[PDB]
Amino acid sequence: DLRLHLLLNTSVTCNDGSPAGYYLKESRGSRRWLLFLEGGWYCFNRENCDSRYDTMRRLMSSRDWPRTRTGTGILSSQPEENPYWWNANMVFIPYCSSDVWSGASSKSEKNEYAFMGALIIQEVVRELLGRGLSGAKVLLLAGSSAGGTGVLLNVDRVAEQLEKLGYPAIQVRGLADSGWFLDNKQYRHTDCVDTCAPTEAIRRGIRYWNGVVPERCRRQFQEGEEWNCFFGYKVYPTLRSPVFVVQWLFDEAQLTVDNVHLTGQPVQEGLRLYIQNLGRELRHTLKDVPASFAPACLSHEIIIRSHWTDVQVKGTSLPRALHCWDRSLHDTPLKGCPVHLVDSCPWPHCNPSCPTGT
Numbered sequence: 001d002l003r004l005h006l007l008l009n010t011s012v013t014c015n016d017g018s019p020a021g022y023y024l025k026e027s028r029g030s031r032r033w034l035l036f037l038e039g040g041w042y043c044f045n046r047e048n049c050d051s052r053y054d055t056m057r058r059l060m061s062s063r064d065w066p067r068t069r070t071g072t073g074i075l076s077s078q079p080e081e082n083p084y085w086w087n088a089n090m091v092f093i094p095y096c097s098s099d100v101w102s103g104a105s106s107k108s109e110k111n112e113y114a115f116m117g118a119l120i121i122q123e124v125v126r127e128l129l130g131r132g133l134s135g136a137k138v139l140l141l142a143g144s145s146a147g148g149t150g151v152l153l154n155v156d157r158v159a160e161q162l163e164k165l166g167y168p169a170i171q172v173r174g175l176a177d178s179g180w181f182l183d184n185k186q187y188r189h190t191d192c193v194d195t196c197a198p199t200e201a202i203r204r205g206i207r208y209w210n211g212v213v214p215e216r217c218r219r220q221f222q223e224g225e226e227w228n229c230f231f232g233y234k235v236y237p238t239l240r241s242p243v244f245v246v247q248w249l250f251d252e253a254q255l256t257v258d259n260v261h262l263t264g265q266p267v268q269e270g271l272r273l274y275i276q277n278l279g280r281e282l283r284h285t286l287k288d289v290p291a292s293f294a295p296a297c298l299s300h301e302i303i304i305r306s307h308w309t310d311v312q313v314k315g316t317s318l319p320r321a322l323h324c325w326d327r328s329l330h331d332t333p334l335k336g337c338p339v340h341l342v343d344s345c346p347w348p349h350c351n352p353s354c355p356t357g358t
Ligand SMILES: *[C@@H]1O[C@H](CO)[C@@H](O)[C@H](O)[C@H]1NC(C)=O
Pocket: 009, 011, 012, 119, 123
């Protein structure tokens, strides 16, 4: 159980102006800190944000947040469920800014909603320093789905923040789960009334949120093209902090934005080739990502699932791969302790350890 703390700086808010916050479970005499970013899509204009406020309000507001949450998967404190970091200080940061953790805009006369995801992360880090983060040796910024993309957008800013605050000894690293998306062609193509492909949706989102992206990526793509930095394979090479990338080869959210709706009906040749080419393109974008875990499964998110230990690539689980990553970052590859684990087989569930969906 992680306990809720609403941000003392009440200028840093969820979409509706309620204070943002974080759930914390301390582990004294651990110098490891895990800050996890929740996911859950985004909204990018007044109408679809209003709709999200009606039926996904916990993703836009802290008014109804429970005072505790149970840590699961990598946020679990039992070794049985979390072989990797069970003894770490655990932080769960609710996603209530609907901006892929990129926003830096307050609710005001001109803005019905606040989009402060980038400032929320910075304020959580700042307020944690007085609760023991000042003594940290590693801060792993992790996240799933939109939170995984949020890791990529924010990990170097957390590193810069701690350096400017006087804590250059804290090693900041990133763990991006299910946030590595492709701006590929859709299987069936809509224009953009709502139908809005992620590239166009993000482009409008950045203007609506006052979204911010990592500085080196911003300098490459420049004014008007920042939406590019929301795509993992474009932003990752600009990053300096070590980042472990977890991505299903056949991610369900990727297939959704590709207008692929798998029906149980038989898969025709056109769709078969589309799905196989998606897996191949994902694999290709991970070729030069040394720390990665990419199983050939049709699924979405891994790291806060209670059975996240079950999936294996080439016989190595994700908790083991992350442990090997830890060893590789000690101050040359490790015998039998791999960190680059990308499936090569070409169809969902060709890996027998894939989640069953049960
Ligand atoms: C609260 O957060 C805002 C946004 O980051 C910042 O400008 C302001 O200085 C903060 N206030 C305090 C008292 O730290």
